[PDB]
Symmetry: D3
């Protein structure tokens, strides 16, 4: 990749990551005002960067983090719904791919999901993802049930999205890559608690999988936490190409060349780790050793991952934040 210009590059695409100000949301009218602001930002960012093809908004940019109201019906939406339809129309008008965050009413009447979507330049929803790893114990969201999907994006990209806490699990980035993604998008609403670990994992998620990472967090203060922004683009070898600071409204742009990541995946010998993981020691054993050597992988596959100190873990429900058990 590169820090880029304002044009569609010959190889690849231009992205803008928006360090969107954290919303303070008290009612549905406030959600409508965030929707209008997000839409305004799509058009304005396209006017400033005419070659733009992928614009990325953070987790909670639509609805905020009003922890006293965020699972009320007033604060939830269907996906797709009227709100994603408005985002879609704006993506169609500006001819961009957009990434949006919606807290989603559960269609079966159970606990709501934390959802991300990608909409293409024709206004079609091409990816819907439900956050696999809610940020417990503060978050009430149901664990996502759609796996980690991938879609075709601009400039030969294969895109996956993950949300905030998801990106701390190397299993999320590995899965994205395994499903074919050469660009992992991470949209986020973290407080300052993990500012260093955000940058660190954006780099490791990239390197381990020969995959670009594009990552952005909300920025500013909502009366409880400060959200750090730190929009970040990492090359497929883990090198940071562009890094935002902690200001509301910082825009982080870069040229990304997906073909280079694909080529490394096809071409690399030493450090072709995405391939090596499941085909070990291929010089000694033609084709590589396929059997799994990791007990955690077996246990997790079987739905019985259990750390040996689990009985002594103190925080296992939401009571510390006042959620009923």
């Amino acid at each position: 990749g590169s820090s880029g210009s304002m044009v569609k590059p010959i190889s690849g695409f231009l992205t803008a990551l928006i360090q969107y100000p954290v919303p303070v949301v008290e009612s549905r009218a406030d959600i409508d005002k965030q929707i209008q602001q997000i839409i305004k930002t799509i058009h304005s960012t396209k006017s400033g960067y005419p070659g733009l093809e992928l614009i990325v908004f953070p987790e909670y940019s639509t609805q905020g983090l009003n922890t006293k109201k965020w699972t009320t019906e007033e604060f939830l939406c269907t996906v797709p719904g009227p709100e994603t339809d408005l985002f879609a129309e704006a993506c169609k008008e500006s001819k961009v791919y957009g990434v949006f965050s919606i807290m989603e009413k559960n269609p079966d009447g159970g606990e709501p999901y934390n959802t991300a979507v990608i909409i293409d330049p024709q206004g079609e929803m091409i990816l819907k993802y439900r956050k696999l790893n809610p940020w417990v114990p503060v978050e009430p969201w149901k664990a996502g049930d759609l796996g980690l999907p991938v879609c075709d994006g601009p400039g030969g990209s294969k895109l996956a999205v993950c949300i905030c806490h998801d990106g701390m699990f190397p299993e999320v980035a590995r899965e994205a890559a395994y499903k074919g993604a050469n660009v992992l998008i991470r949209i986020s609403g973290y407080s300052t608690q993990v500012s260093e670990q955000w940058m660190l994992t954006n780099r490791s998620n990239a390197w381990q999988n020969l995959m670009y990472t594009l990552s952005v967090n909300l920025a500013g203060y909502d009366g409880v936490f400060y959200y750090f922004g730190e929009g970040q683009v990492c090359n497929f070898d883990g090198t940071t190409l562009v890094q935002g600071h902690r200001n509301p409204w910082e825009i982080v742009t870069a040229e990304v060349y997906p073909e280079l990541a694909d080529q490394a995946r096809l071409g690399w010998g030493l450090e072709n780790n995405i391939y090596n993981l499941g085909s070990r020691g291929y010089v000694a054993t033609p084709g590589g050793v396929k059997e799994n050597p990791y007990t955690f992988v077996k246990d997790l596959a079987e739905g019985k991952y259990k750390v040996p100190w689990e009985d002594e873990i103190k925080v296992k429900d939401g009571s510390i934040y006042g959620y009923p058990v």
Copy 2:
């Protein structure tokens, strides 16, 4: 942890990571010479740091990387054998735990293993590990078949060792932690190709698992590659506490406090990721959702991990380095 002093700390232990000069080895006599030099280093390092409890030598410190001879009978050892017995006697005399690298004859006559051992202050071998992920296509070693073991170490530690390339797989660090390790040791013989990614993964391996990492590579030139050294100690939150440069014989020391990592594992709410991985969204679903959402985990567990571009991967054997297919 801390950059420390030369004493046994009240809560933990003192470690010395040796950026051992890369050996140039032409015969078994040269291996004997390296053995003697390693042993000399155990005693000298203990004399300089009287509180020392864990001394760590890099991969290939015993035998070098003579790629024309490294799988000949002359260049291989049994584990345990006379060579590990000499290391053991030195650990007993200096009253330290030691970590050593031996290229190991395969007891069935097949391809040899790349092995690491931990020996305790009584001279007992308490851990034997065979490199799970050889550095293909340059390395001829058989994929390890002993899993990733853990043992009791000094200062309340639970130690695991991995070797070089292994530490680029987040699955290795995750497995170590899952088996109970609160300190992952990475012994390494990498060339300069991965200097940045070495530091990056030592940090991410620590953070993702609330685990200390202690990591050291050979240093210097062997006539083919330059080996970067870069001994590194990372806190359980991923923060680098001490970092060596690229000189032969640099010694990197630090105080490590294993109980702090155990306590974070028992105590942390937000970012208790080692627990969260297999018990998702516990606020919405009491006890957490246990079902595996990752296709790669299923496929790997089933011995059928296969990336979707596998047929187009160019490097699948050792022919580029002159190994017969």
Copy 3:
């Protein structure tokens, strides 16, 4: 220490350092407004971080830096007084230790002090400190007369506070440690002039004394200076564990483990400097050489510290900032 979570750690405590926006204060009503905002921040920060035990506000967070009014009666408070009582009630309700800044009317009628207090989770004032080293020539405050006190804090801590400019004097950090502190708190209202030296001294103050440092400055623009924020937590070996940027309202949190600093003080050989300072060369001389080798220490002790170029120093009063020379 560590960058931490939102829980009370098993060995220590969780702290939040608030890069409070610099207040623009024109009247007593504005001071009341800041008090309300500080109190609101205590409750809101505790709700976000349930394990929180120590919340730290910067210098001038209560009253601002209105240099045309800051020594008028309207802009000063008694310590304790109604304002610290309101802070105390908030610390009691949220069950936290709090650190606050109050410009203090001098009880004898002389020049006012720049004061910091620590209030415990029962709402008791457990520490009162008057700034030893006013930021001259801009600051009008009387040099502090209470020494550098220490108190018991959360998680086995022994806390000391210093204010802004104080932390540029290694003598301040040394004194805190010598009085028993294993955590030095620095509350500050600096402009951008010293941004780099802020971070540097927070590290050196820690390392030299085998002591944690927790330090935070106001952030934002007041119409004259930009205040840099840069909340910072340093390990007892000087390593920065967490670092804020320059934004108003950034919260910097960390886990601190005071017992690790105490243990290093008891255990370290090489680099046990807090002990070595006054007991030199103990291998050659059993018990160490005790006699003072520093002329500045003697002179300062005797109230006659005088640099050899003192007669040629140009700035010796507040006239450059329009203070009358008295």
Copy 4:
């Protein structure tokens, strides 16, 4: 200051800091060898940098750290003596100021001193300093008894020297400045244990006192420790101007402008800390408050500095390193 050229600057002087290889010294003949090497280095460095006025060698550059022989008569010298005479002749011939390290026989037959000298371009010894703060418990040296002297140096400098561990005490840098020094020279023989804290204190020692710092350590391995080098020049505001790495024989040069430090001392208002220390709150109290507010200063002045936990300190003699009672 500046990273400079190879000329005598119009306002100041050029310095070369030598990351001299740590000597391995087994006899007096080896000490003679180091003397010859040091002298060779004076001449060669002057030939390379014709404007050079101050060359600085590290602690133990003459005699090494043979901890089994370093207090024997064979390994000690008188100061002045034949060895400093040879250094002096070399300074005279090359027309430079030089800074040298000698372990010094105690003229009364008691424990030896660790000594530094400055010799001028006429071959006169203009400064003799005995290490105030031996690095206990490893070092056997008697605590210095000459205070912290200052002398006139090149380019309007007032020079002080301190040794290794001394520079960890802010009281040493403060004393140098109080005696009139505008350049503090730190010659050192530290192991890698304090690499970070070396750079940190070289910066703080400068900033706190509006003083340049010029600091250099031995580099390389002596069979026990690795010595980090890291020659460092800091501006009077604490900014690092030039920084060496950890290699034997690295030369760190810089232009230093002493009059700029003197001018800041005369001119600065805010942050004139060297003046402010003993004259507090001068706006409220004309002339400043002079009384000492620091108990440690009183106690130290009275020869009774005693930390409140002193009875529980574990390391109070050299027994951990095998020094008798």
Copy 5:
């Protein structure tokens, strides 16, 4: 230099670089507001830093970047004019040198210029510079026609100013030095696209010419771009002495010692590059070889600089930003 205090240093001067908030400007009334705010900032900054002698405002601090109105008559000014007269009165009252940005009506009726001025402590305009390298294709400004002037400044300085994109051309910094400048001031209204390259070029512009650099950008969001601030002072050897972050209203101050740069220029042997450029290999050839070895220098001098891939360059007019393509 040094991070400094708030006094006039004995050898040099104190500067304040203002990371002025990017204005959102809809009308002339908004331009008048910015003028008042700039003036307020001059007085307030002087009150905070009594030794201050040079205050620097960014490009577009007066008029913003309203790309739909920025070349209308309502949004342009004459230089000098009533607006620079108000800046001048404020410099006189506070006794400082000031650096200001004005989008300038072209006196011949052609396309407007992007202009910077320096005003001295007596309120006299001592430098006027028209941006040589407009930020194309977004900017409509006429390429500057006044060269790169220099003037006398405080503390023995010889000042030059350049504007934003200008500082990406090493030819600009070289020219400033060649004309005698020992301090190059760069005033800027860049978006985040070049945040790293800003810091990099401020250092290289300094080192290559044995020249101090003082550089500052607008900060904040205007509804289209985020402007990064990053006020920066570099020593004459390229070392960064002080660095601002990306916040609106950050003030970056430093002591600068111009005489140290002059002395290096007179004194340095190895790396006296500003001299070496045009007198090569003087040990082998007494006086140095003077002939041009660079084809680009010849071509540029002759007004025929043409890169060998020029015919394939895609962006050669303003159409991608909706500017009509003329002639």
Copy 6:
């Protein structure tokens, strides 16, 4: 680019920059030893990195910096000559492009040149460059007279080479780019005096020209100077991709993708500076303003570049290093 693997990438090429130990050279026999060692390094490096296409050796790697002997006939070579023939045979055998440094006898008997060559995988010399900017006053070399040439390299590259001090002149990097280079190679024998400025200029040379930079210096001590190594690969936007430290024999490798730099040159709008330099303000003036605004460019083009303080410059000959003046 990328930190890469050991393979020929699908879009570009793999390079190895050798931080070759500084030679201490006392005679022609020592030069022959360096030639053998360089050749050995070509073969060994190819064995370690089978996809390698470009290997780069530093300035003075063949002959050292024996300043008392370096212009004697014994220490000089012809270019081409037997020595470059041996390098060429090694490049042919290993199938790599190689970059070498030779101090070159002047064919007219005058002062010698400091020369760099590029040899291709068929053993053909495809580029010869004489150092334009000798490192005065220490260097005795004649100012180069061949301009700054360019050649075709591996992976669609257009290569230029410059030598040490040359890379401190932005005019050198600009010229390389103007002649078509998308990869500038800088081979160097600097002392530690310019360590920081080396890294800085390698980045600015890249960014200003939308050009990759590949740069490497000798490393180690020769009895006079320490040579810093610091092999460095910069992306065409100025971002450092790989950075060596100061050790002898460090090998710095990277994948470089020349077509990405060409594409940015064709495609970029904002910051297409290599184009913008000579066609200014093209929105206001169709085609851009072509007239030169820089007096230094006019003066230099006219062979009359003269700084206004030139009469007061103190160092104008080699006398400070003992070179006779005339």
